[PDB]
Design a binder for this molecule. Structure first.
Ligand code: SRM
Ligand code: SF4
Ligand code: K
Length: 456
């Protein structure tokens, strides 16, 4: 288990060739596993640092995780600056010993693909005239819980306010240090920013950030999100450039019989002009393809099975690694997802909603790596073949799903979803999401204040 520091998930093709080689000749699984934090992982490393170092990559005492950045903004020009800022916060936060690991993102509305509410510190980009002018700071998200422990909880991030671009690093540092100092010194399970905020108060925390940063936040500038999914397929970028996002189930890059995904990405990397972007959804964007290069790239991706069409449901589903490599796994996630969505696809078709989607996620244990706690339908592993079923989140990821059923099996999960989806298909309003609907229809009470009403 080695993991690289790759802000915004942008990786060059040169770097891609060096990791593809290593993955194949020096690991048990021979795979490249894209993670939901925009970086990659090798599994079963049988040196790695000199390999990383040689292509300019570095492997992260440091309580800092990979800083995310919206990978494919609708206003393509905004990416360059937002990415430059992600990269700067990354290097800036690089060595203080934090009580718990600190997660940070730079978001570009209206896309919340980086799933901000799962993170400690978030900078929501505010642009004017195609230029970033500042950020809206949201602080305090975290998804990890412990089964049966009502003192733990998933929490969404809180809005602190707006800050001009210039005050970015000072604020970033102030948040880190204030969590570092105020973080719970007695228990590690209460040491996350989300716990500290609830202990001292958002306002008490905010006032301190201001004092330390040397500024005063301005009121939050309007922003809204419309989704969290990737833009699978070709999208027009700036100039004559195009972006091809490839759907990769579980982000597992390996050559399968008749679907050489791994060789396919290597072939593309060899003729690709720009670079690649690893998404927060475990997919890969072949970025900056000249219009003239579209057919060449598409030809390879197509041959390799990288462009095999899947349903919208599949494209919007996610699972953590879990078995066989995770030591904390309670139930299958990655290896369970595919056949599981095979089942969901059938139920979707049975209900005439095959063109629809439900943000469906499966996490192998309460730690929550699969981000099931921000899904419309989340599966939290409890034991082999068993999961806690949570319902009631939303498409954009701003609501925590309450536990609906506990410790049940797939046949039981499927039987419950069969009935709920059927109701949704027939009783929903125009454009109404499944999560919102379960809450509107009274199928599940909403979680309005995580720290106080997440547990029944
Ligand atoms: C690879 C990935 C899930 C995936 O399939 O993509 C993952 C994989 C692993 N996670 Fe994670 N988590 C991943 C994103 C996160 C997420 C979601 C996110 O960050 O977007 C969270 C939930 C949000 C949160 O932090 O609250 C998450 C919360 C945890 C926790 C709980 C931490 C806590 O505060 O309690 C742990 C366990 C721990 O460290 O105590 C952890 C533990 C672990 C490790 C590294 C297991 C371990 O501690 O030894 C899991 C490794 C499995 C394996 O064999 O590879 N992981 N994990 C993600 C790696 C991200 C990265 O590149 O750094
Ligand atoms: S959620 Fe649990 S099982 Fe899944 S990858 Fe994270 S630690 Fe392992
Ligand atoms: K994926």
């Amino acid at each position: 288990l080695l993991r690289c520091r790759l802000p915004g998930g942008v990786i060059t093709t040169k770097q891609w060739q060096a990791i593809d080689k290593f993955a194949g000749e020096n690991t048990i699984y021979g795979s490249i596993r894209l993670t939901n934090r925009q970086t990659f992982q090798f599994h079963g490393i049988l040196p790695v640092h000199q390999m990383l170092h040689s292509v300019g990559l570095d492997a992260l005492n440091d309580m800092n995780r990979n800083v995310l950045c919206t990978s494919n903004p609708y206003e393509s020009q905004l990416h360059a600056e937002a990415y430059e800022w992600a990269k700067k916060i990354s290097e800036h936060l690089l060595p203080t010993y934090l009580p718990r690991k600190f997660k940070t993102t730079v978001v570009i509305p209206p896309q919340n693909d980086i799933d901000l509410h799962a993170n400690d510190m978030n900078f929501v980009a505010i642009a004017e005239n195609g230029k970033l002018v500042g950020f809206n700071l949201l602080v305090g998200g975290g998804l990890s819980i412990e089964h049966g422990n009502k003192k733990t909880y998933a929490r969404t991030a809180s809005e602190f306010g707006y800050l001009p671009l210039e005050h970015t690093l000072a604020v970033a540092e102030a948040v880190v240090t204030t969590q570092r100092d105020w973080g719970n010194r007695t228990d590690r399970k209460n040491a996350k920013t989300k716990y500290t905020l609830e202990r001292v108060g958002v306002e008490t925390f905010k006032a301190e950030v201001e004092r330390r940063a040397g500024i005063k936040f301005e009121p939050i500038r309007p922003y809204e999100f419309t989704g969290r999914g990737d833009r699978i397929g070709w999208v027009k970028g700036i100039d004559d450039n195009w972006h091809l996002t490839l759907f990769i189930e579980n982000g597992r890059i390996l050559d399968y019989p008749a679907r050489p995904l791994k060789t396919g990405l290597l072939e593309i990397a060899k003729i690709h002009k720009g670079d690649f972007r690893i998404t927060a959804n475990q997919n890969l964007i072949i970025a900056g393809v000249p219009e003239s290069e579209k057919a060449k790239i598409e030809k390879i991706a197509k041959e390799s099975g990288l462009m095999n069409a899947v349903t919208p449901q599949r494209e919007n589903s996610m699972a953590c690694v879990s078995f066989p490599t995770c030591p904390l796994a309670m139930a299958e996630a990655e290896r369970f997802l595919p056949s599981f969505i095979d089942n969901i696809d059938n139920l979707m078709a049975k209900h005439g909603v095959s063109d629809e989607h439900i943000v469906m996620r499966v996490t192998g244990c309460p730690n929550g790596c699969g981000r099931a706690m921000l899904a419309e339908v989340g599966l939290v592993g409890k034991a082999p073949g068993r999961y806690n079923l949570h319902l009631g989140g939303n498409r954009i990821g701003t609501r925590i799903p309450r536990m609906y059923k506990e410790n049940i099996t797939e046949p039981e999960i499927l039987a419950s979803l069969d009935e709920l989806i059927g109701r949704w298909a027939k009783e929903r309003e125009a454009g109404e999401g499944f999560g919102d609907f379960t809450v509107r229809a009274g199928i599940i009470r909403p979680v309005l204040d995580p720290a106080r009403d997440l547990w029944d």
